[PDB]
Design an enzyme around this catalytic site. Structure first.
Site, PDB file in Angstrom:
ATOM      1  N   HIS B  53       1.050  -1.571  -0.108  1.00 45.08           N
ATOM      2  CA  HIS B  53       0.025   0.500  -0.078  1.00 45.08           C
ATOM      3  C   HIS B  53       1.138   1.355  -0.067  1.00 45.08           C
ATOM      4  CE1 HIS B  53      -2.285  -2.776   2.402  1.00 45.08           C
ATOM      5  NE2 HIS B  53      -3.639  -2.423   1.854  1.00 45.08           N
ATOM      6  N   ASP B  56       2.363   1.627   3.788  1.00 50.22           N
ATOM      7  CA  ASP B  56       3.057   1.226   3.552  1.00 50.22           C
ATOM      8  C   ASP B  56       4.542   1.821   3.950  1.00 50.22           C
ATOM      9  OD1 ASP B  56       1.472  -0.849   4.506  1.00 50.22           O
ATOM     10  OD2 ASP B  56       1.407  -1.826   2.452  1.00 50.22           O
ATOM     11  N   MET B  87       3.132  -5.358  -8.250  1.00 52.80           N
ATOM     12  CA  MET B  87       1.225  -5.875  -7.659  1.00 52.80           C
ATOM     13  C   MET B  87       1.499  -4.704  -6.127  1.00 52.80           C
ATOM     14  SD  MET B  87      -1.417  -5.015  -4.809  1.00 52.80           S
ATOM     15  CE  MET B  87      -1.361  -6.879  -4.136  1.00 52.80           C
ATOM     16  N   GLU B 180     -10.521  -6.752  -5.217  1.00 49.06           N
ATOM     17  CA  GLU B 180     -11.256  -7.646  -4.054  1.00 49.06           C
ATOM     18  C   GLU B 180     -11.916  -7.629  -3.228  1.00 49.06           C
ATOM     19  OE1 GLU B 180      -7.785  -9.150  -0.526  1.00 49.06           O
ATOM     20  OE2 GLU B 180      -6.840  -7.510  -2.221  1.00 49.06           O
ATOM     21  N   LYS B 182     -14.696  -9.072  -0.205  1.00 43.86           N
ATOM     22  CA  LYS B 182     -14.569  -9.073   1.390  1.00 43.86           C
ATOM     23  C   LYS B 182     -15.934  -9.032   1.949  1.00 43.86           C
ATOM     24  CE  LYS B 182     -12.462  -9.247   5.132  1.00 43.86           C
ATOM     25  NZ  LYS B 182     -11.388  -7.880   6.902  1.00 43.86           N
ATOM     26  N   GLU B 216      -9.819 -13.500  -2.063  1.00 40.67           N
ATOM     27  CA  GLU B 216      -8.549 -13.713  -1.028  1.00 40.67           C
ATOM     28  C   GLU B 216      -9.450 -15.357  -0.461  1.00 40.67           C
ATOM     29  OE1 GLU B 216      -7.648 -11.329   1.652  1.00 40.67           O
ATOM     30  OE2 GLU B 216      -7.736 -12.579   3.145  1.00 40.67           O
ATOM     31  N   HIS B 219     -11.090 -14.591   2.263  1.00 40.29           N
ATOM     32  CA  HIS B 219     -12.703 -13.660   2.324  1.00 40.29           C
ATOM     33  C   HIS B 219     -14.021 -15.001   1.930  1.00 40.29           C
ATOM     34  CE1 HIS B 219     -10.195  -9.562   1.880  1.00 40.29           C
ATOM     35  NE2 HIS B 219      -9.981 -10.435   3.048  1.00 40.29           N
ATOM     36  N   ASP B 244      -4.784 -14.007  -4.066  1.00 39.11           N
ATOM     37  CA  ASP B 244      -3.812 -13.459  -2.731  1.00 39.11           C
ATOM     38  C   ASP B 244      -4.751 -14.758  -1.542  1.00 39.11           C
ATOM     39  OD1 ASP B 244      -3.641 -11.272  -2.155  1.00 39.11           O
ATOM     40  OD2 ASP B 244      -5.350 -10.560  -1.036  1.00 39.11           O
ATOM     41  N   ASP B 254     -11.828 -11.732   9.883  1.00 41.54           N
ATOM     42  CA  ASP B 254     -11.208 -12.493   9.047  1.00 41.54           C
ATOM     43  C   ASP B 254      -9.836 -12.786   9.333  1.00 41.54           C
ATOM     44  OD1 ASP B 254      -9.321 -12.250   6.441  1.00 41.54           O
ATOM     45  OD2 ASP B 254      -8.578 -10.020   6.505  1.00 41.54           O
ATOM     46  N   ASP B 256      -6.851 -14.025   8.235  1.00 47.55           N
ATOM     47  CA  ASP B 256      -5.436 -14.514   6.850  1.00 47.55           C
ATOM     48  C   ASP B 256      -4.034 -15.118   8.146  1.00 47.55           C
ATOM     49  OD1 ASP B 256      -6.846 -12.633   5.842  1.00 47.55           O
ATOM     50  OD2 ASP B 256      -5.296 -10.295   6.745  1.00 47.55           O
ATOM     51  N   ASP B 286      -1.164 -13.244   1.591  1.00 51.40           N
ATOM     52  CA  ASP B 286      -1.836 -11.706   2.594  1.00 51.40           C
ATOM     53  C   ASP B 286      -2.404 -12.113   3.988  1.00 51.40           C
ATOM     54  OD1 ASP B 286      -2.384  -9.711   3.164  1.00 51.40           O
ATOM     55  OD2 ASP B 286      -4.650  -9.968   2.595  1.00 51.40           O
TER      56      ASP B 286
END
Ligand SMILES: OC[C@H]1O[C@H](O)[C@H](O)[C@@H](O)[C@@H]1O
Ligand SMILES: OC[C@H]1O[C@H](O)[C@H](O)[C@@H](O)[C@@H]1O
Ligand SMILES: OC[C@H]1O[C@H](O)[C@H](O)[C@@H](O)[C@@H]1O
Ligand SMILES: OC[C@H]1O[C@H](O)[C@H](O)[C@@H](O)[C@@H]1O
Ligand SMILES: [Co+2]
Ligand SMILES: [Co+2]
Ligand SMILES: [Co+2]
Ligand SMILES: [Co+2]
Ligand SMILES: [Mg+2]
Ligand SMILES: [Mg+2]
Ligand SMILES: [Mg+2]
Ligand SMILES: [Mg+2]
Lengths: 387, 387, 387, 387
Positions: B53, B56, B87, B180, B182, B216, B219, B244, B254, B256, B286
């Site tokens: 991102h 980030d 990406m 993406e 969710k 994902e 998700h 993902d 979620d 992960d 992810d």
């Protein structure tokens, strides 16, 4: 009050009030209903019309002769009552030959049979005045990963629906198809499991204008999705051809409770959307009177379906007509959601320093959305407590 | 064995190994990671590349000057290691200004800001070599029914993505978008909640060829859907631009988890599909190392992601190469699923008495599908028990 | 109408209205609230009292000196308003030291610390007049199977609660414990995940009379369970010491919506049970104003909690007082459910031919339960449509 | 390898392999099995024994004469094979008379009938050598809130089980009861929905030592709970009298897949617990061969149940015997979980400054739990990839 009339467009499947109450763990608790008796009893409750699977009306394996006598009897009842048949569908799930699917069975000869069985009932559906032909692929799917190549299955599903559209087109029929999604049950996972997956798939068909969706309240709720949101997306796409109304308490087996039971606030927001979007199709009830009930309870449960729709319609209309609610909608900037983000265009947006370089991010972040006050007004209106 | 190399195309988000472990009920358990250190440590584990991102890499609110120094440092690290950036994506969810969404916030000025924030990071993404630009609309949605007119919101969402495509097109960039999905969290319901809804929505964009999905694992599993089936549908549509990979135990928040944790058999059928369909994009993780772990546990969890993919790849290849499995696939008629149902055409199907009038429905119904024997062969191969 | 007064026993956690809106994906959207301001604002809304975690009132790591000044300020506010403190609890989940649990952390020294931290706040709770001390073990659990030996963990959990009861007993305190279950979040699975598991565990404690449950609407709903049924079982066991009221839309992350939001019919049946069983404890709201809201929305959401309880109470009282509903209850044989099955005893039952040999099973099977008519009367009463 | 023998204690219900494949949407796909043929075919597969509902063995409504001939035939088959009958149960759910329940039906005469029907089959069960008598109250529950007063229903349920214990006690039978929980299906919500609720309820019975639980893998998974954790709690309480093994993919209808299908890692941690706790009861399979299968697929699916248990047992034993895993368990402080928190006593804990005043909370917080490395060792062992 809240008496239904035919103008309200309430319809019922023969298989709803006629459910005998056999479930995975128990035998039937009610005797079978004559379809003629259902038509007449539903007419007297205020219903607009009925719908049917082929096998609800004509017992499976009937001769050409027996079939014509079942249909003439039923036609007589419709003619006597003025009841309409706005939608019909095929039973591609009960007989053991469909245990691996109809259109996407691994065995090619079953798929051919499935198509011929469907085509025969489209002819009847059109003769009876149906505008929508629903397809629920309840056996299309798998319990295990290796049993179904899903890309090949989607090829076969597209093949089948493309052939149905060629058929209706070649006959000059004025009937459209609606795919009814369901995420699971009776297969471990069913293909096209949500409104979203069905909408995407339609866009790959040869003649996408002939196909829309028939979403069911409880089915999207079996995936824990927001049913009004999904209906909004189907409307936005222009594909809400039909709708199945009922109730469901959460993620579990398919309950098919009477409409208004289950998630009551979702029912409220559903009716608010259908009415404010001007949906003009049937309000169809796909529900099962619980097997605890006798025949008086069947008709009470059916009346309750229409009653709850009419009450919620009234509360939703009062909600939207309340000047205090209109004020709340403005305080929450629902009206700014309808304004284009950048009708001034991409270059103007890029050169607009107020949209980035000089945007006061802290001031904007500090603004309350006032959503809880708006939602409490909605609660007050639903509960009739605006006083 | 099962040592990853760059040819395996394993990628990681800066925000995965760099997750400090703040959850809704607890403060951070790990110190922040320098993005340079993550690049180097990931290079040494065998990773192909990293993703990010904007926020980030560049702390929110950085000056033009500080931003350039953050980017040059990061570029230095990529150049030193040969690590790729396949990406990138935008953070449109952390800062309080996005509390009602980015592209579909009720407030118009937030939506304009959201677009300008995104456009700036596309420029950086392309400069760094990114081929896919992911959009996860985690704040697009609602906790209550009246807060969001979903049809207007979809108008605004289409408007935003249409503008992004006009921008990339006007710049001549060779980058594509992946949405993406969710279903919920952190909003009560998120718009475009599944792979299906995202695929449908793409077909209403002005230039649908520029957009695909970034599904994902966890998700789709938060809606209780079958992730391999959904990936199959995205492949079938030609829209699997990115993916993902992680793990999730059922319908809850979620999680992960590292890939391979959660639903292990779904992971097996996922890898079998990706490899047999020849998916050639990044295998992107992810995931969040649980906040119980120190920094050694972070890198153990990251290595475990790649390890589990490589083990499952091996088991899936052995499964498909087993002549006993090929025999089982034929016994279950997977090969007849690939044959067209009616390449002889509609008129030939209608005139074929063997497809209906003379179809022996009882004989066909009696045929076992032999799916359990096939699934037990798959189990034996997954568990390395073929002996 | 529906104005709350202190006699209604509505209470709120400091951490509810004081939630700053940090979630797993976003920073705080509201400034912190002074606990003194919360007490005064809640008094003015009609609340009966407040509750607190130690760390809500006293910032973690405070000196003996700073602690006394935080407590005296708070005591001043209670004395000025007459507000009560009926319940208190310990924060054994936010600080990183509790990342593997408090009472069931693998590390022994953390478990000892957890107990000493709890014991210190019991002393304060009793000084302030608390009758119930709640324990929510939100970090007791695991993300992976090997991390926790659950039998040893239950030994340690029993050990901890047995020590707390020895402590309160040795001090002569008149305070009781209530365990608050939650199935998951923030741990992958939390120990004692439902009201049922907590009730069972209490029966293995040394002094079971000191312990009951604090069930939370949304927590049991995260396992898809029927919250009124579970409350009925806790009442039946004599263990409903306290209750947390809020809303939840299905199986997903813990939403902590205002009471009445989420499953509205469950809220109705909950209030009907609490009032007809004569529950006399606090009606405590454990909810989070959505982070979309500013401070006006916080107090609107809090008022809405009490408002919805009072509306539902009225509708439930009208339901039970309706002679038509009483008639419906008799038609459904609710009154025969209260009669003993065999007060005549086992030998009389065995020798009763009308109970088996001569029991007309078909006649009994044919009787409708009339449940749908009863449920539609309940719907009509909830919606204020009895007219 | 992985050949089952009678010493492995694998048992099957007559109703499992004998499931004809009728589901809520489809007719039977297989012919009925003679119970004699099932006994012999199961003996040849390596099974230890069979179990039965009364109505599996004796067709409902049989005369005293027909009943004796059904039982003698079955006894002949057991005597010929050495097959055991370790458990029996009552069908209190299929016949329409039980549509509102057995023990908690609103109608008193149904409850009396339910008890007499149960008592008759206990006599047969004991004659055949059964040690456990299972009760699954699949019709005890409700679809709507007003239909069942749950406190009265629990009174009636306690009354029924207290009478059964008086009966077994008065006859001097050496047989114990196990309650099998299920959260929903076929009722909207079923009473005692989880292992936890059943354990709590047992503690209110007159003779709690006669009652334990029969948990089913898939049933706890229909509430999204962790099945190994729940089994751990039942063991910890001393109440794991029996267990039903099968598979389930998440929160949906009750799938009853063959054991090892569904959540494979949960199956692994389940077998690890049962074997390391020394559970010595039957490994009973309550599963349904999918209705896609013919009779060869029925026996393949049944063999697969035992096969998967034996493979997982081997992997779990190898896991616990691995010195690297033992080292990992110590690094994660599983051994410190078994040490008492405060065997030095309450006063010593209160006077211990190292437990609070001088406890270095930051040092403790910094310690990693090393759980991901341990879980990846478990993954490697499950997949046979330790090489
Ligand atoms: O498509 C017609 C109907 O077929 C079946 O009865 C389905 O259970 C129902 O979901 C569907 O609406
Ligand atoms: O889109 C990039 C990522 O943004 C956020 O970190 C999301 O939680 C993750 O789901 C997504 O992949
Ligand atoms: O026990 C006190 C409270 O602690 C935490 O805030 C929990 O999230 C809430 O569930 C609980 O009621
Ligand atoms: O109790 C015996 C069995 O009865 C029924 O077949 C249930 O579906 C199964 O869950 C249970 O084990
Ligand atoms: Co349905
Ligand atoms: Co995720
Ligand atoms: Co909560
Ligand atoms: Co089951
Ligand atoms: Mg339907
Ligand atoms: Mg992601
Ligand atoms: Mg709580
Ligand atoms: Mg069972």
């Amino acid at each position: 009050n809240y008496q239904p009339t035919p103008e309200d467009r309430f319809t019922f499947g023969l298989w709803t009030v006629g459910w005998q109450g056999r479930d995975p763990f128990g035998d039937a608790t009610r005797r079978a209903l004559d379809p003629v008796e259902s038509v007449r009893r539903l007419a007297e409750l205020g219903a607009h019309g009925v719908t049917f699977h082929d096998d609800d009306l004509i017992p499976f394996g009937s001769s050409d002769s027996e079939r014509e006598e079942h249909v003439k009897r039923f036609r007589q009842a419709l003619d006597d009552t003025g009841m309409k048949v706005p939608m019909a569908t095929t039973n591609l799930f009960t007989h053991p030959v469909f245990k691996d699917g109809g259109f996407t069975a691994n065995d090619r000869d079953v798929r051919r049979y499935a198509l011929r069985k469907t085509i025969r009932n489209i002819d009847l559906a059109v003769e009876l005045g149906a505008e929508t032909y629903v397809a629920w692929g309840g056996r299309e799917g798998a319990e295990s990963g290796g049993a179904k190549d899903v890309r090949d299955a989607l090829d076969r599903m597209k093949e089948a629906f493309d052939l149905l559209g060629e058929y209706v087109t070649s006959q000059g029929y004025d009937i459209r198809f609606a795919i009814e999604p369901k995420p699971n049950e009776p297969r471990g996972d069913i293909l096209l499991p949500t409104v979203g997956h069905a909408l995407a798939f339609i866009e790959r068909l040869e003649r996408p204008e002939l196909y829309g969706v028939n979403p069911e309240v409880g089915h999207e709720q079996m995936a824990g999705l927001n049913f009004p949101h999904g209906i909004a997306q189907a409307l936005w796409a222009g594909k809400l051809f039909h709708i199945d109304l009922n109730g469901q308490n959460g993620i579990k087996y398919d309950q098919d409770l009477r409409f208004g039971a289950g998630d009551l606030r979702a029912a409220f927001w559903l009716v608010d959307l259908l009415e404010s979007a001007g949906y003009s199709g049937p309000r169809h009830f796909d529900f099962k009177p619980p097997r605890t009930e006798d025949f008086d309870g069947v008709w009470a449960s059916a009346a309750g379906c229409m009653r709850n729709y009419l009450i919620l319609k009234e509360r939703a209309a009062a909600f939207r007509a309340d000047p205090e609610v209109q004020e709340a909608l403005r305080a929450s900037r629902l009206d700014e959601l309808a304004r284009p983000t950048a009708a001034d265009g991409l270059q103007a947006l890029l050169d607009d320093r107020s949209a980035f370089e000089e945007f006061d991010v802290d001031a904007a972040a500090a603004r309350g959305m006032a959503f809880e006050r708006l939602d409490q007004l909605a609660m007050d209106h639903l509960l009739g407590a605006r006083g």
